[PDB]
Amino acid sequence: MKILVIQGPNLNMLGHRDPRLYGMVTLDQIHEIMQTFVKQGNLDVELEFFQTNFEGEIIDKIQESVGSDYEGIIINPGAFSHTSIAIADAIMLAGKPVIEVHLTNIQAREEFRKNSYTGAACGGVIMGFGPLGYNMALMAMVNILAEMKAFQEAQ
Amino acid sequence: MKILVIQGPNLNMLGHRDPRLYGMVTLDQIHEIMQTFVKQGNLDVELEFFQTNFEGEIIDKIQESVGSDYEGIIINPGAFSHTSIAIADAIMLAGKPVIEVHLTNIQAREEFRKNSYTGAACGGVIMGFGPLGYNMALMAMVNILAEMKAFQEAQ
Amino acid sequence: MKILVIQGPNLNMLGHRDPRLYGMVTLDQIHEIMQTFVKQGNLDVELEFFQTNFEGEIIDKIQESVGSDYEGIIINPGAFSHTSIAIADAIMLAGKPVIEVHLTNIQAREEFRKNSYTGAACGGVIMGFGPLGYNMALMAMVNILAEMKAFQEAQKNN
Amino acid sequence: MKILVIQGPNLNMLGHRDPRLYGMVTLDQIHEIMQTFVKQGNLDVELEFFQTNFEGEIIDKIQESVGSDYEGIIINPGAFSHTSIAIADAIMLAGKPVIEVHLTNIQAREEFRKNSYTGAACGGVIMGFGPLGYNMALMAMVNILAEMKAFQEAQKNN
Amino acid sequence: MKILVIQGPNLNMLGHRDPRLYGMVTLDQIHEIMQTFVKQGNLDVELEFFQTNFEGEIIDKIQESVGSDYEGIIINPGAFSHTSIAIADAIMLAGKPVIEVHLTNIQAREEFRKNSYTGAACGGVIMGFGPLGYNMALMAMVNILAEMKAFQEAQ
Amino acid sequence: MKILVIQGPNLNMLGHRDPRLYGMVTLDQIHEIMQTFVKQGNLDVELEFFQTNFEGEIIDKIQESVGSDYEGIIINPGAFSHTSIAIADAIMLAGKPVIEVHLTNIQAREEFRKNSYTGAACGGVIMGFGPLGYNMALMAMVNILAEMKAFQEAQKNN
Amino acid sequence: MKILVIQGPNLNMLGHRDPRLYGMVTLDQIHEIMQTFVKQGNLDVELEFFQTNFEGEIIDKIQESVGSDYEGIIINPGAFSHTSIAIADAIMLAGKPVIEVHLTNIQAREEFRKNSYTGAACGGVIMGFGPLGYNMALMAMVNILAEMKAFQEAQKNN
Amino acid sequence: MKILVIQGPNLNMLGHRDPRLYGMVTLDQIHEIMQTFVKQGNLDVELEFFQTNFEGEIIDKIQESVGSDYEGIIINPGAFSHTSIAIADAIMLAGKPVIEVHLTNIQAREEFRKNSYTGAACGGVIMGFGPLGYNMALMAMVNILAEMKAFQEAQ
Amino acid sequence: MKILVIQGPNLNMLGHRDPRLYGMVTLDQIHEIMQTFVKQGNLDVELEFFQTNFEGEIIDKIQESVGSDYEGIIINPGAFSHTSIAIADAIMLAGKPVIEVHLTNIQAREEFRKNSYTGAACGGVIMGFGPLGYNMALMAMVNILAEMKAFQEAQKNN
Amino acid sequence: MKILVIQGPNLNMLGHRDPRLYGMVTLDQIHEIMQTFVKQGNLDVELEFFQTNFEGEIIDKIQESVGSDYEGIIINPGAFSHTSIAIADAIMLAGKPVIEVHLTNIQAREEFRKNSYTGAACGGVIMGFGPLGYNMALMAMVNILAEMKAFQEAQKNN
Amino acid sequence: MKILVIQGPNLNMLGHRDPRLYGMVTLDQIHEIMQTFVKQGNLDVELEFFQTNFEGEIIDKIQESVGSDYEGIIINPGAFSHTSIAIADAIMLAGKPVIEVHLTNIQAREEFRKNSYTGAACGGVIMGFGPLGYNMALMAMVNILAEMKAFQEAQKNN
Amino acid sequence: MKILVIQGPNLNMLGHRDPRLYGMVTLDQIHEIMQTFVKQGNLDVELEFFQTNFEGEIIDKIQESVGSDYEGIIINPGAFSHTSIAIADAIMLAGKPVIEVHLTNIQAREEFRKNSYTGAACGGVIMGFGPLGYNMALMAMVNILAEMKAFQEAQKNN
Ligand SMILES: O=C1[C@@H](O)[C@H](O)C[C@](O)(C(=O)O)[C@@H]1Cc1c(F)c(F)c(F)c(F)c1F
Ligand SMILES: O=C1[C@@H](O)[C@H](O)C[C@](O)(C(=O)O)[C@@H]1Cc1c(F)c(F)c(F)c(F)c1F
Ligand SMILES: O=C1[C@@H](O)[C@H](O)C[C@](O)(C(=O)O)[C@@H]1Cc1c(F)c(F)c(F)c(F)c1F
Ligand SMILES: O=C1[C@@H](O)[C@H](O)C[C@](O)(C(=O)O)[C@@H]1Cc1c(F)c(F)c(F)c(F)c1F
Ligand SMILES: O=C1[C@@H](O)[C@H](O)C[C@](O)(C(=O)O)[C@@H]1Cc1c(F)c(F)c(F)c(F)c1F
Ligand SMILES: O=C1[C@@H](O)[C@H](O)C[C@](O)(C(=O)O)[C@@H]1Cc1c(F)c(F)c(F)c(F)c1F
């Protein structure tokens, strides 16, 4: 069970600064924490991680997952959450569970961050938990897919 | 470690109808699922559940948790999320982790549901996962408190 | 038929002043008039009346009616019309006809009274007829419930 | 009493399709039902019916009623509800009761249907009861006109 | 010099009621007052008056004045001032002076009366003077046309 | 196929004012060009032309097309595009393809021209090609109708 | 004169959270200070205190004051200031002076705090003086009541 | 019968430039044209003219006319029309006819010019006629005062 | 303590127009009443009064108070409350307590009066008590200053 | 004439998702149909196709067309229609006809799709005809180019 | 060249506090720095400085410059940037280069500071560089005026 | 000092047309002018230039500069100024001075150009001086960096 984790613009800069709202934990460290979570719960998942500052590369990537062996996507589209109708359209046609994560609470900052076109397209949205948000999303992804598979077999 | 779970207006009507967006699982069933999660992960938590259709009873309850042995609150304020400045003010003065859950994705419905005064006051917000959202919040609550306790002891 | 009549905040103050914008008839008198409209029409309708200033009591009451032997609700949610998404959510799950009444025309007053969340969730809305609006809702509820019965019997024999 | 019943744009297309959002009863049938509600109630009421797709014909008609022997208007201005300040201006000078009816609940549809200029100028508004709304307006108009008569006689003897 | 005076919806109801903001003077009386003004100042104008409650009849009429011997239009489009893009488009193509009159001050009533699509298309707008507004417009019309004729001859 | 071409307010004034933003081609010339487009394509199309400055005349004509011999409508509602919910409602019940045409690009002018109630009710909208837009609407209409027909025989056979 | 002091949601949490934006003075201490202000001014005022987190309890209390022994109300509706048309409606029918107090300046915080439905229904509003605001409301209330009374005897005598 | 004519900010710059929307006629020339109008119609009025770029001087001036022998005010508050609640409050308490004039059509320019707080307080508003607007206002002022005087005497 | 009282545009016209919404009490009378309030309270306060219709004169005066002998400002900026960011900026740098007063309740009039830039810059705002508001501002100012001073000696001693 | 066809984000996913709102026809099939439309019309047109999910790749391509051999552009910018001022700016300096196409009617979907920055920069916009829209854009482009050319020789000769 | 430097409301309070958001340099010091930037660059520029809190004095001053021997204006209109259509109107008729300066970045503060009417009328705007912004405007004005001179001479010899 | 100069979408098209709204100087020429302003001022500044139409390349580039030997950024984000929260986020974490430049005055054009997310995150913004704006940013960056150095040395010896 391959889960694709997509990390949007500026997420690669975690650690390398603004620790007063994001922390000194890096993105590579968050990805280690996700692997730890997989093993600690013995969840049968194999993660692939992708970060980019390009809207088009996020779109290419979601598209590429269509009819691939990726069963689900966990995404933090970064500032593109608030602006990217194109990424939301891509999420809409993905044909699999997509879950949005934000490290910060996007209801609790500037007004321009409240809208998320991408989160409106996702099955579910997690915000405000920092790095832990991504393990939260892993957990949901497993339950969502297992549940979908029960509807498969028992039909 | 007592965690208070507060469930707002109409949450008691889960099961008893609109299963086409909320499902036939009842609120009492969600609370059983949370207990199952506690035992299955052997988390040292003791939950207390409270449901009400009164804004004032949610406020009384959050207030009552101040300087009590409740260490955290998981809340689904229901339709009061979008309207209740009074509940948000209560959340602000609670002095402990508060986490908001919604069964549905509130970015993906009517425009009047997008605002959450209460979620803006909470540390973190979870939406769109159905019943599972509450186990997601349990998991965050444990990590948040454990982490706070590390900052306690190692200081 | 048991019909439940819910009267929201400040409706109990009818005729205990503002005899200009609302008249000098009391809530108790309006309810008497409704009873008299049933009795006179020989309608098989038992009315039950509930006034409250509490949003949560209105939701409690609408919830209580689910799986009860109430066939319908006539509601004036008062000021909560404009603000209560919670009461609209309760109406949406009521599973029975709910008719909203306002004594005044809420299109013809302050801007803040124009939105009615509860009204939008109700099948039908009556406004600006004063106390008469409640007798209009009675007439409507009876006709709605008859229609519903005839539809239900005529489908069960097919 | 002569009551004038004005039916605005596209109301003539009732039952000539969209049998889902509006039903399959025709405008002619609704008017028959209204006639039958008068006859059956032995109401001293003569109904006159007017449908038009023209804003100017509706205003002409409301104007024509001033100093006429029409005692009241029941109006469904259709889409002109939301846009016609001109028809609201005509209602405001009508000098007689005007009741607005909508078959559908205009609080529960597209945003552009929520404003009713004409509704705000009418004494009272009924919406979301389908064809029944017209019989509800009839009931109301009769009661309004009675009240008006009793008030007028009881002041002239004082 | 023919001047067409166009009077919009409900103007025919002047006198016949709401004298508490419009007065007991009728529309036919305003048209007499305009003729009085023509003779009293010995202005070489011949007025034609047209009232209608139809948007389409106002449009037909303005159109009909194009390449006619009407040299100018004085118009009170009534409630169509606030709504009629079609009447404004007609005014725009009229090819002659058009002047808007309102009996009431439309900056000083409801918010829905503040916009005038038609007045924005007119050369000039007069409001708030009652019946006198129309003699004011007559006076401007004469000066405007005389001035245009000076630019004609002296070119 | 009889196709109805409805032209809204002021369209009759083409080539008789504003050579700048519109053309110097008249409305009659546009209609000749459309006829020419049919005849030389040897299309089996009989065009019917109707211009009016009256909203209600447009609604009358759309209604008259219901259950008629007309298989489609090409419409430029003029300034009523932006204002007429009534005409949009008529389009919604037309029961046949309706194509909206504008000479000008309505996304690129005043803010008040951007909304088209009528365009949102139409299946397709063409704008900003000038008189050519109408021939584009003819091409589309023939193709829509041929596809619709091939579909009705595709289905009657399974 | 009995004066009623109504304190809305969370006001009971003063001095038990957020020393920063509010004080460290408790609600009971504020109430002692008001009593102290009366007693030392030798004012003939009997204060009655009521705090609640329930909108409906506030409306109940305002209503209960109609035709009672209370001559005035000093109110801080808390967050319900910004949301409660219901409480504003209650204030409008109170029939006696109602003064709104806020500890903080509600013009100088979040945008959602700027509106006060309740303040607009009150005769006067005091904000941003902290606990002192309540003593200012006491001073005003005594002066309003004394002026009102002197006026009732000014008039009965001519 | 003294009529005060108040001319607001930048009106003194008429002539001295932007003749492509205002013309080469100066303010002093407009005031001569008003005197010409008085004599030509033999109207018993004595005008006083005041121009200023100060909001406070317009307010002082309107105030000063209260209980003076000024019977009416014709005002072009300039850009202060759109912004000056203080000037509108002054107009409201003036106790005599006040008429607003604009040389340009303020419904037909930028959106920030559409509001006129001052015109909403005035009895009537004239726009879009250039210099002639002020003679239009003179004419209305005479009729308004004469009419008020008929209501005086015949009462 | 010298306290400066700044009165904005049109405040000088009190009692010389609109007996209705304002009083019939003049501005000079209000100023006498304030002096009277000080003298009878045996407050050590020397009031200085300044009225102007000029925004820039208000800003000049607030600035002139910086590093002066004045310990506080009571201000009614009149219509400039709603418009003057410049005056709000001046208030922000004043370096001493500034209290805003309105005779009327600015939450309960036209929409354009609701914003107060100046009020948001002031520590506290009093509205809708009429001339009494000014005596309330005096009471508050003395109390604010006494508390501030007691604090400066509370701190120099530890 | 070489005509460039630019297809924006997700257009490559046609027929590989959402048979409902779009077709089941693929992007390559649409491009074949356009080629077919040229060849059978014996048009002298050489089409060049470019799809990308990158805003900057669209801007690169429009720029690359400046002073190139391409005489026109047919563009569907996809979701960038609603967001991309950058692409609109590129269109504005393109120096040749640019036609915008949408498969769907963007006036009739979510509010966020209504604006098209790119459409307002284009000379003409076609929407809501599905894949046929592209052939309509081809017809228009040939006609625009032929008219432009006839004009350049109309003018060089006087 | 004579360049006029206009400093609007509260700019005289620079360095007389808020040493945090604005710094501790005075207006007089900034003007000294500008003088020193001229002297050091051996620029043939005479600077004239004017500060005022009066909107009317700023307009007077800009008007006074018309037909004067001032070749340019550097203006910081302070809070009047956001509100003064009157000062923008004066700038528009100045007939010479006008550059707006703000010490702070007005895009990065309260919403009410984002609009600059005066800035929109100026050729160019500089913000968020503190006192340096004035030296930047000096550099720009010199370069603008040189360019203007070279253009004027090189056209007069053609 | 190494200063990085980022030029956003369509800036490469300068002087390759719209010689009216933007002039006929090229991007390459502007960069030459900047180089010449350094050389002539004998500034110890090495300029590096980067143009791109890709939002992601601009973010990549700003990120690349973190922990590099670039001391500062001069940026014109072009149309991405108004839309890119992503580029603003990159600016906010740059940890070095970033100055925004626009050739045109973005307060004086379409409404959609008034917001600058990137500008608000930059320390300072320059607009409406054409190519000169870049030399103004150079002057500023040098002065900013000097100030920063003097501050840093004078604190390390304390
Ligand atoms: O014409 C309208 C709508 O424009 C209006 O919003 C509701 C409305 O007034 C009502 O519910 O009665 C009416 C609804 C309506 C229609 F919109 C319509 F198109 C019809 F053909 C029709 F028969 C009909 F009843
Ligand atoms: O009537 C209108 C406008 O009101 C609409 O905005 C565009 C519109 O639908 C179009 O571009 O076709 C049309 C434009 C228009 C006109 F606005 C107009 F005034 C004419 F005289 C005319 F001939 C014409 F074509
Ligand atoms: O309850 C509120 C706010 O919601 C309101 O905006 C201001 C308010 O009315 C005031 O300043 O008095 C009050 C402020 C306020 C609180 F918001 C609050 F959470 C408290 F615990 C409290 F004690 C308190 F005073
Ligand atoms: O000048 C104003 C108004 O513009 C403001 O809205 C209220 C206001 O600040 C107050 O209530 O004190 C004040 C009200 C006001 C006036 F508006 C006014 F015109 C007066 F002549 C007057 F005496 C007066 F007090
Ligand atoms: O990309 C889009 C939308 O974002 C745009 O609103 C309409 C749009 O430009 C059109 O109707 O052509 C296009 C619609 C659209 C999609 F939104 C989309 F996700 C696809 F996969 C697709 F194939 C498609 F055509
Ligand atoms: O790209 C843009 C605009 O989107 C922006 O609003 C102004 C802008 O940032 C500026 O004035 O520098 C820049 C203006 C602009 C362009 F919009 C453009 F299309 C060009 F080709 C160009 F060379 C150019 F400079």
Q: Which residues, 6+ apart, have CB-to-CB distance to E45 below 8 Å?
A: E1, E2, E3, E38, E138, E141, E142
**Which residue, by CA, sits nearest to atom 9 of ligand 2?**
F78
DSSP state for residue B15 in the 8-state scheme: S
Does residue A5 contact residue A32 with C-beta atoms inside 8 Å? no
Q: Give CA–CA dist D76/D123, Å, rounded.
A: 14
Phi, then psi, of K122 in degrees rounded to 5: -75, 155
K63 with H53: Cβ contact below 8 A: yes
Q: Give CA–CA dist F50/I108, Å, rounded.
A: 54
Structure solved using which method?
Answer: X-ray
Among D102, D77, D101, which Cα is nearest to D89's?
Answer: D77
Q: Give CA–CA dist A84/A117, Å, rounded.
A: 6
Ligand 1 centroid to Cα of residue F90, in Å, is: 10
Q: Give CA–CA dist A83/A104, Å, rounded.
A: 17
If DSSP codes are grouped into helix, strand and coil, which group holds residue D101? strand
Tokens 């959510």 sit on residue: C89
Nearest CA of chain C to the CA of G75: how many Å? 18
Nearest CA of chain D to the CA of E49: how many Å? 18
I61 Cβ inside 6 Å of ligand 4:
no
Residue of K nearest to I115 (CA): K112
What is the Rg, in whole angstroms, of the alpha carbon atoms belonging to chain D?
16
- Which neighbouring-strand residues pair with C72? C3
Q: Which residues, 6+ apart, have CB-to-CB distance to L128 below 8 Å?
A: K122, K123, K124, K125, L102, L103, L104, L105, L106, L108
Beta strands (DSSP E) in chain E are 2-7, 46-51, 70-76, 98-102, 124-127
Q: Give CA–CA dist C108/C118, Å, rounded.
A: 18
**Which residue, by CA, sits nearest to atom 9 of ligand 6?**
L78
Ligand 1 centroid to Cα of residue F100, in Å, is: 22
Write out the H or E segment, with its range, that includes residue B75.
strand B70-76
**Which residue, by CA, sits nearest to atom 14 of ligand 5?**
J78
Q: Which residues, 6+ apart, have CB-to-CB distance to B25 below 8 Å?
A: B14, B15, B130, B131
**Tokens found for residue J73:** 């552009």
Burial of I126 (0-12, 13-18, 19+ CB in 10 A): buried
Which amino acid appears at position H95 of this protein? G
Q: Give CA–CA dist B124/B140, Å, rounded.
A: 9
Q: Give CA–CA dist C72/C97, Å, rounded.
A: 5
Query: How many other C-beta atoms lie within 10 A of the C-beta of residue B12?
Result: 19
B10 with C56: Cβ contact below 8 A: no
Residue E78 with chain D: CB contacts under 8 Å:
86, 89
Q: Which residues, 6+ apart, have CB-to-CB distance to B88 below 8 Å?
A: B117, B118, B120, B121, G79
Residues in chain J whose Cβ is within 8 Å of chain F: 105, 107-108, 114, 116, 119-129, 132-133, 135-136, 139-140, 143-144
Q: Give CA–CA dist C141/J1, Å, rounded.
A: 70
Catalytic option among A31, A102, A117, A134: A102
Q: Which residues, 6+ apart, have CB-to-CB distance to E127 below 8 Å?
A: E101, E102, E103, E104, E105, E106, E107, E133, H124, H125
Phi, then psi, of C115 in degrees rounded to 5: -70, 130
Among G37, G60, G33, which Cα is nearest to G141's?
Answer: G37
If DSSP codes are grouped into helix, strand and coil, which group holds residue I72? strand
Residue-by-residue DSSP string for G53-120? S-HHHHHHHHHHTTTSSEEEEEEE-TTHHHH-HHHHHHHHT--S-EEEEESS-TTSS-GGGS--HHHH
Strands C124-127 and D124-127, bridge-based pairing: antiparallel
Ligand 1 centroid to Cα of residue G137, in Å, is: 54
Which ligand has the minimum distance to the alpha carbon of residue J104? 5
Q: Give CA–CA dist E116/E87, Å, rounded.
A: 11
Phi, then psi, of L138 in degrees rounded to 5: -60, -55
Strands G98-102 and G124-127, bridge-based pairing: parallel
When scoring D126, D132, D138, D141 by the number of chain C Cβ atoms within 10 A, the one with the most, hence best to mutate, is D126
Which amino acid appears at position C62 of this protein? I
End-to-end CA distance of chain E: 21
Does residue K95 contact residue K68 with C-beta atoms inside 8 Å? no
DSSP state for residue A37 in the 8-state scheme: H
What is the Rg, in whole angstroms, of the alpha carbon atoms belonging to chain C?
16
A76 annotated ligand-binding residue: yes
Q: What does the CA dihedral C102, C108, C112, C117 come to, rounded to 10 degrees?
A: 40
F61 Cβ inside 6 Å of ligand 2:
no
Alpha carbons within 13 angstroms on the beta-carbon side of residue I57 total 14
Q: Give CA–CA dist D3/D43, Å, rounded.
A: 12
Report H helices in chain C. 27-41, 55-64, 80-83, 85-92, 117-121, 132-156
Burial of I147 (0-12, 13-18, 19+ CB in 10 A): exposed
Q: Which residues, 6+ apart, have CB-to-CB distance to B26 below 8 Å?
A: B14, B15, B16
* Cα torsion angle, H66, H68, H70, H74, sign: negative
Q: Which residues, 6+ apart, have CB-to-CB distance to I63 below 8 Å?
A: I90, K10, K12, K13, K53
DSSP state for residue E66 in the 8-state scheme: T
Alpha carbons within 13 angstroms on the beta-carbon side of residue D101 total 24
Among B12, B38, B37, which Cα is nearest to B26's?
Answer: B12
- Alpha carbon separation from C118 to C47, C83, C123, D129, G13 (Å, rounded): 21, 9, 10, 16, 33
Q: Which residues of C are annotated as a binding site for substrate?
A: 76, 82, 89, 103-104, 113
Write out the H or E segment, with its range, that includes residue I139.
helix I132-156
Write out the H or E segment, with its range, that includes residue E91.
helix E85-92
I140 with G136: Cβ contact below 8 A: yes
Does residue L107 contact residue L114 with C-beta atoms inside 8 Å? yes
**Which residue, by CA, sits nearest to atom 14 of ligand 6?**
L78
Pocket test for ligand 4, best of H83, H89, H98, H117 (most atoms within 8 A of CB): H89
If DSSP codes are grouped into helix, strand and coil, which group holds residue K50? strand
Beta strands (DSSP E) in chain J are 2-7, 46-51, 70-76, 98-102, 124-127
F119 with J133: Cβ contact below 8 A: no
- Alpha carbon separation from E130 to E27, E119, H94, H102, I55 (Å, rounded): 11, 17, 21, 19, 36
Residues in chain B whose Cβ is within 8 Å of chain A: 105, 107-108, 114, 116, 119-129, 132-133, 135-136, 139-140, 143-144
The chains found to touch L (3+ Cβ pairs under 8 angstroms) are A, J, K
DSSP state for residue I20 in the 8-state scheme: T
If DSSP codes are grouped into helix, strand and coil, which group holds residue K86? helix
Q: Give CA–CA dist C66/F62, Å, rounded.
A: 46
Burial of A67 (0-12, 13-18, 19+ CB in 10 A): exposed
Measured in residues, chain K has a length of 158
**Tokens found for residue C120:** 């939008």
Under 8 Å CB pairs connecting chains C and G tally to 55
Among H50, H60, H55, H57, which Cα is nearest to H81's?
Answer: H55
Residue of J nearest to L80 (CA): J86
- Which neighbouring-strand residues pair with H50? H6
**CA of residue E94 relative to chain centroid, distance:** 13
Nearest CA of chain A to the CA of B136: how many Å? 6
Q: Give CA–CA dist G114/I114, Å, rounded.
A: 9
Strands A124-127 and B124-127, bridge-based pairing: antiparallel
G84 with C80: Cβ contact below 8 A: no
Q: Give CA–CA dist C47/C32, Å, rounded.
A: 10
Report yes or no on chains I and K touching (3+ CB pairs under 8 A).
yes
Beta strands (DSSP E) in chain I are 2-7, 46-51, 70-76, 98-102, 124-127
Q: Which residues, 6+ apart, have CB-to-CB distance to C49 below 8 Å?
A: C5, C7, C31
Q: Give CA–CA dist J97/J74, Å, rounded.
A: 8
The chains found to touch G (3+ Cβ pairs under 8 angstroms) are B, C, I
Q: Give CA–CA dist L72/L70, Å, rounded.
A: 6
Measured in residues, chain I has a length of 158
**CA of residue H153 relative to chain centroid, distance:** 27
The 3-class SS string of G5-66 reads: EEECCCHHHCCCCCCCCCCCCCHHHHHHHHHHHHHHCCCCCEEEEEECCCHHHHHHHHHHCC
Phi, then psi, of B35 in degrees rounded to 5: -65, -40
Among C101, C141, C103, C136, which Cα is nearest to D137's?
Answer: C136
K26 annotated ligand-binding residue: no
Edge to edge, what strands does the sheet with G70-76 contain? G46-51, G2-7, G70-76, G98-102, G124-127, I124-127, I98-102, I70-76, I2-7, I46-51
DSSP state for residue A88 in the 8-state scheme: H
Which amino acid appears at position J65 of this protein? S
Under 8 Å CB pairs connecting chains B and C tally to 54
DSSP state for residue I1 in the 8-state scheme: -
Return the axis-axis angle of helices L27-41 and L132-156, rounded to nearest 10°. 40
Nearest CA of chain G to the CA of B27: how many Å? 25
Provide residues with CB under 6 Å of ligand 6: J 85, 89, 93; L 10-11, 13-14, 22, 76, 78-79, 81, 102-104, 106, 113
Q: Give CA–CA dist H10/G156, Å, rounded.
A: 58
F10 Cβ inside 6 Å of ligand 2:
yes
Under 8 Å CB pairs connecting chains H and K tally to 54
Which amino acid appears at position F64 of this protein? E
**Tokens found for residue D53:** 């797709």
What is the Rg, in whole angstroms, of the alpha carbon atoms belonging to chain K?
16
Among C6, C123, C142, C140, which Cα is nearest to C63's?
Answer: C6
Among K48, K51, K34, K39, which Cα is nearest to K4's?
Answer: K48
Task: Report which ligand 6 atom has the smallest distance to the Cα of L80.
Answer: 4
Q: Which residues, 6+ apart, have CB-to-CB distance to K94 below 8 Å?
A: K62, K65, K66, K73
Does residue L67 contact residue J77 with C-beta atoms inside 8 Å? no
Residue of J nearest to L55 (CA): J56
Q: Give CA–CA dist H101/G47, Å, rounded.
A: 57
Q: Give CA–CA dist E33/E55, Å, rounded.
A: 26
Ligand 4 centroid to Cα of residue C110, in Å, is: 23
The chains found to touch K (3+ Cβ pairs under 8 angstroms) are H, I, L
Measured in residues, chain D has a length of 158
Nearest CA of chain F to the CA of J69: how many Å? 23
Does residue I3 contact residue I72 with C-beta atoms inside 8 Å? yes
Tokens 């051999």 sit on residue: J69
- Which neighbouring-strand residues pair with D99? D74, D124
List, by residue number, the catalytic residues of F.
22, 102
Q: Give CA–CA dist C14/C25, Å, rounded.
A: 7
Phi, then psi, of D9 in degrees rounded to 5: -60, 135
Alpha carbons within 13 angstroms on the beta-carbon side of residue C149 total 9
Strands K98-102 and L124-127, bridge-based pairing: unpaired
Among I29, I4, I42, which Cα is nearest to I137's?
Answer: I4
Does residue E66 contact residue F17 with C-beta atoms inside 8 Å? yes
Which ligand has the minimum distance to the alpha carbon of residue I23? 4
When scoring B109, B126, B144 by the number of chain A Cβ atoms within 10 A, the one with the most, hence best to mutate, is B126
**Tokens found for residue G19:** 């020393």
Among D127, D66, D65, which Cα is nearest to D101's?
Answer: D127
Beta strands (DSSP E) in K22-134 are 46-51, 70-76, 98-102, 124-127
- Which neighbouring-strand residues pair with F124? F99
The 3-class SS string of chain L reads: CEEEEEECCCHHHCCCCCCCCCCCCCHHHHHHHHHHHHHHHCCCCEEEEEECCCHHHHHHHHHHCCCCCEEEEEEECCCHHHHCHHHHHHHHCCCCCEEEEECCCCCCCCHHHCCCHHHHHCCEEEECCCCHHHHHHHHHHHHHHHHHHHHHHHHHCC
D104 annotated ligand-binding residue: yes
Strands H124-127 and E124-127, bridge-based pairing: antiparallel
Which amino acid appears at position K11 of this protein? L
* Cα torsion angle, I113, I114, I119, I121, sign: negative
Does residue A75 contact residue A25 with C-beta atoms inside 8 Å? no
Among F88, F90, F96, F89, which Cα is nearest to F118's?
Answer: F88
| Nearest Cβ partner for D80 among F60, F86, F93 | F86
If DSSP codes are grouped into helix, strand and coil, which group holds residue B74? strand
What is the Rg, in whole angstroms, of the alpha carbon atoms belonging to chain A?
15
Q: Which residues, 6+ apart, have CB-to-CB distance to I157 below 8 Å?
A: none
The domains located in chain E, with CATH, are 1-155 (3.40.50.9100)
**Tokens found for residue I8:** 């904005």
J120 with F133: Cβ contact below 8 A: no
D136 with C132: Cβ contact below 8 A: no
